[PDB]
Amino acid sequence: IDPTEFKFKLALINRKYDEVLHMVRNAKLVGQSIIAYLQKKGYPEVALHFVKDEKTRFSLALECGNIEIALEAAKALDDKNCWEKLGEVALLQGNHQIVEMCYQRTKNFDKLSFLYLITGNLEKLRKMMKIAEIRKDMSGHYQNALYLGDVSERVRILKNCGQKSLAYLSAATHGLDEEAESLKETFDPEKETIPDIDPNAKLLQPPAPIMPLDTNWPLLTVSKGFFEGSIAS
């Protein structure tokens, strides 16, 4: 008999990783049944080295938390569901650069705007505000203008949406006197009451970022698991 299959399974069960690696390198392992067994026993890291199929490789790379291999497989597959799952796993590992790329590829503009806010990238957040304007997403455009503290764009959005009363209130409350006067001329003085401005109104300015997050979350070089270090060489 060829005992290779059950010896491999028994070496894995007994955590004899040296014997498993020696069998993987030197034993004739036939078919994908052993790869399926490695995955099912919680060793997707070992299975990943033997899979060429990009869909299976992507799934195993996500289970391993190997974002680099998952990124290569996701680029080859170019599927929206692959990008969404890669984004979730990359976020859990603090890799905000891959999360940014996944949200760009999935066109998830609201999550991308929130990511730029929490990372302190105000320049990219201002690009997201322009993208919302081009898409005619008035709600997203106003939300991005709130994140930036841009009262002038908020007044412009309210004016374009026909909300004259709110546009005047916003402009006059925030000291945009030229825009407030221009809006005031559009009120019919016989029929429309001009809103009184609260002189005690406070500026709701977003806090400034102290330390913007340009680099990914620093990962400790955890000792590459016995399998990753030995197979790669």
Partner 1 sequence: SKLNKVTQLTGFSDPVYAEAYVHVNQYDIVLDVLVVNQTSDTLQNCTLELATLGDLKLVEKPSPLTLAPHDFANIKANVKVASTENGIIFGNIVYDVSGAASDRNCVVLSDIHIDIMDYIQPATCTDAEFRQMWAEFEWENKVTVNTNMTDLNDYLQHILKSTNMKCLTPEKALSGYCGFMAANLYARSIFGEDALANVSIEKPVHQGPDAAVTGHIRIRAKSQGMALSLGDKINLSQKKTSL
Partner 2 sequence: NNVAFMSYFLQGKLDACLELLIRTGRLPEAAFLARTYLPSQVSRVVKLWRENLSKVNQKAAESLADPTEYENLFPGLKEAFVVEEWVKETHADLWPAKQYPLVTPNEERNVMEE
Partner 3 sequence: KRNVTVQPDDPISFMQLTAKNEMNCKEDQFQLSLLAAMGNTQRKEAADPLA
Report the interface residues with partner 2, using CB under 8 A. Answer: 65, 91-94, 96, 114-115, 117-120, 122-123, 126, 146, 148-151, 173-177, 197-213, 217-220, 222, 225
**CA-CA-CA-CA torsion sign (102, 105, 110, 113):** positive
Q: Rounded to the nearest whole angstrom, what is the least distance from the CB of residue 136 to partner 2 in the complex? A: 21
**CA-CA-CA-CA torsion sign (128, 130, 134, 139):** positive
* Choices 35-43, 127-135, 136-144, 217-225 (CB under 8 A): range interacting with partner 1: 35-43
**CA-CA-CA-CA torsion sign (125, 144, 206, 182):** positive
Q: Rounded to the nearest whole angstrom, what is the least distance from the CB of residue 101 to partner 1 in the complex? A: 25
**CA-CA-CA-CA torsion sign (20, 25, 26, 29):** positive
Q: Does position 137 bind partner 3 by CB under 8 A?
A: yes
Looking at residue 46, the DSSP 8-state letter turns out to be: H
Strand, coil or helix: what is 25?
A: helix
- Given the complex with partner 2, which of 75 and 120 has the nearer CB atom? 120
Residues 52-81 that bind partner 1 (CB under 8 A): 56, 59
x/- site string to partner 3, residues 178 to 207, per CB under 8 A? ------------------------------
Q: Which pair of tokens denotes residue 5? A: 């299959």
Instruction: Please give the backbone phi and psi of residue 161, each rounded to the nearest 5 degrees, phi first.
Output: -80, 0
Q: Which pair of tokens denotes residue 51? A: 């899979």
Among 32, 143, 182, 230, binds partner 3 (CB under 8 A): 143
Interface residues toward partner 1, by CB under 8 A: 1-2, 5, 30-33, 35-36, 39, 56, 59
